[PDB]
Amino acid sequence: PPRFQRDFVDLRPPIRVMQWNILAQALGEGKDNFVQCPVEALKWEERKCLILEEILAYQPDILCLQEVDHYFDTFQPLLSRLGYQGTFFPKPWSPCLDVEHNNGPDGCALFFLQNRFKLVNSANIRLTAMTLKTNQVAIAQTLECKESGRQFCIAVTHLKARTGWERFRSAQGCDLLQNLQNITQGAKIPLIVCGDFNAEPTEEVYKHFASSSLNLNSAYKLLSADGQSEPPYTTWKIRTSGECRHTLDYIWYSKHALNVRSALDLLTEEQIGPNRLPSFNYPSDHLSLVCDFSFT
Ligand SMILES: [Mg+2]
Ligand SMILES: [Mg+2]
């Protein structure tokens, strides 16, 4: 398992944030076409256990998830027993509903440790594209640290997928930024944004986040030598369409208000295996991103 191989890179009451597209069960079996992954490795009982194990390994204070189609039967009750408050917001027209024997819609989930934070406000945002209501969503919550009293905003999203939706993703991202501008009262409140943006760093939506007056940096850039380059991948798998290896996942943070203390490194080509992800020992086609933050 990758959790025995991946290390925290030392980059400096810390707040640990975990970002993960966990792979919806209905999509893994019905839409993704993982041609080199054993079908037995895609079974829900096996996947469920590995996803929980990942969360237990990294002990996050905040967990931001995409492609969650087992929130009500699994993640909400189990994480509640471990002290996490959860919020779930489904895609209005989830692709999971196209799959036989699905478990309902997928969507975003946001969990936080109740004993660490008080919930100040919350918003379930249906993203718009130049006012067009889209099929993608975000959750944004303002939390208050119970030890320091410091407030901050955490948001999670999953943007429109696939080639041909670059301008659409850009419009979505712009709407999200506008919403966060309002919630954080014009960057008065520190911000962390987790997501599968379905976009590599060359896309306009990435450039919008990097140039926003919210003054956001991308945390996993700090793994690079000069701190100026995004990782080579956050997802790596083989589909009927071909092998996909790219960077689509990000943790954005207020550069002037938050410091990154650590980041969980990626797997090497040798460690990940020729058949890539998911596998018998890893439940998603995306690696989890995990960072420790501290207030400046
Ligand atoms: Mg997926
Ligand atoms: Mg709106």
CA of 74 to the centre of ligand 1 (A): 19
Tokens 């850039």 correspond to 221
Q: Does residue 16 contact residue 62 with C-beta atoms inside 8 Å? A: yes
Rounded to a whole number of angstroms, the distance between the first and last alpha carbons of the chain is 35
Neighbours of 167 (CB within 10 A): 13
Q: Is 286 annotated as a binding residue?
A: yes
CA of 9 to the centre of ligand 2 (A): 37
Alpha-carbon span 72 to 208, nearest angstrom: 34
Method used to obtain the model: X-ray
Q: Where are the beta strands (DSSP E) in the chain?
A: 8-10, 15-21, 62-66, 84-90, 107-113, 117-129, 132-145, 151-158, 191-196, 216-218, 235-239, 242-246, 249-254, 258-264, 289-295
Q: Is 4 annotated as a binding residue?
A: no
Alpha-carbon span 164 to 216, nearest angstrom: 26
Q: Is 256 annotated as a binding residue?
A: no
Query: 253-268: b or e for each residue (b if 16 or more CB lie within 10 Å)?
Result: bbeebbebbbbbbbbe
The DSSP element (H or E) to which 56 belongs, if any, is helix 44-58
